[PDB]
Amino acid sequence: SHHWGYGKHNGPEHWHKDFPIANGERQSPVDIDTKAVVQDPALKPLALVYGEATSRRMVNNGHSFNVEYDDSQDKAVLKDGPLTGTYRLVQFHFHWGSSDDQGSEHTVDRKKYAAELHLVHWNTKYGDFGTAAQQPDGLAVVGVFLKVGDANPALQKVLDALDSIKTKGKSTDFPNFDPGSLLPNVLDYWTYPGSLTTPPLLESVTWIVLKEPISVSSQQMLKFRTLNFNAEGEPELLMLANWRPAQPLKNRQVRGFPK
Ligand SMILES: NS(=O)(=O)c1ccc(C(=O)NCCC(=O)/N=C/Cc2cnc[nH]2)cc1
Ligand SMILES: [Cu+2]
Ligand SMILES: [Cu+2]
Ligand SMILES: [Cu+2]
Ligand SMILES: [Zn+2]
Numbered sequence: 001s002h003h004w005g006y007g008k009h010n011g012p013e014h015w016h017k018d019f020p021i022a023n024g025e026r027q028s029p030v031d032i033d034t035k036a037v038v039q040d041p042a043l044k045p046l047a048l049v050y051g052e053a054t055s056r057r058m059v060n061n062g063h064s065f066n067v068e069y070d071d072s073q074d075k076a077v078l079k080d081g082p083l084t085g086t087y088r089l090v091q092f093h094f095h096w097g098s099s100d101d102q103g104s105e106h107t108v109d110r111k112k113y114a115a116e117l118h119l120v121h122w123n124t125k126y127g128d129f130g131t132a133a134q135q136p137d138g139l140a141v142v143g144v145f146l147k148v149g150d151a152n153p154a155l156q157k158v159l160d161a162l163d164s165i166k167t168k169g170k171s172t173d174f175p176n177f178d179p180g181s182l183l184p185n186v187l188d189y190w191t192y193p194g195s196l197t198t199p200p201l202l203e204s205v206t207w208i209v210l211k212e213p214i215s216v217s218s219q220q221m222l223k224f225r226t227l228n229f230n231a232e233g234e235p236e237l238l239m240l241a242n243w244r245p246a247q248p249l250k251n252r253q254v255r256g257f258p259k
Pocket of ligand 3: 005063229
């Protein structure tokens with residue numbers, strides 16, 4: 001009955017009451033002020049090694065929907081970029097807004113995109129996702145902006161499944177989806193140390209925010225908003241918006257690759 005969300009009484013501005021780390025030193029998302037971005041020769045190109053990724057199911061968790069990957073072996077991994085070691089892909093999900101002018105979590109010189117994709121990975125040094133989530137070098141999330149414009153056929157494959165998982169707790173089988181199909185052609189990125197953008201808001205995420213967006217149509221964006229926060233039987237609560245706004249940078253440094 002009490003959890004958290006994006007509504008009038010359970011929203012981001014209140015999360016600190018239940019999760020005090022909400023007001024911590026390394027919270028996400030942030031605005032990326034491009035004039036302030038630092039060039040670090042230590043940064044490498046990203047290595048997203050997704051050829052053998054095994055998608056399992058798509059699930060409505062009552063705050064967004066996740067496409068879940070098999071993370072029992074090194075099947076889809078992220079390495080290099082700002083990272084040391086190997087990070088296994090566990091899931092991806094999206095955030096979006098109630099109209100096309102808003103919905104991304106990260107912003108770029110205060111600009112908001114319509115949505116943002118998060119590919120979530122964990123450091124195999126820690127044995128499991130949960131253990132990794134509690135360490136500063138434990139997680140790496142790749143964020144990809146969705147910019148309104150042309151319809152995205154790879155995204156349409158995801159959106160065609162949402163009618164199966166309209167309500168909280170529903171899941172559907174979702175095999176053979178290549179998470180690489182949702183990446184831009186150029187993998188230039190910004191990086192900074194931050195947090196999970198939902199409860200439990202843990203400060204364990206090396207953020208990797210791609211500079212180049214992928215496309216989405218306005219029509220496609222309507223489809224995100226047909227999901228429900230609630231479980232079947234309960235009063236309907238449309239998943240109109242599920243983004244946390246920019247949080248204070250607090251003298252963290254955003255680095256850019258290749259500049
Ligand atoms: N918005 S975010 O990317 O900062 C983010 C990412 C993850 C969480 C989180 O709380 N993680 C739970 C993910 C999950 O459900 N994993 C289950 C294990 C699994 C095994 N196979 C697939 N999934 C919160 C915010
Ligand atoms: Cu909740
Ligand atoms: Cu909720
Ligand atoms: Cu609460
Ligand atoms: Zn997210």
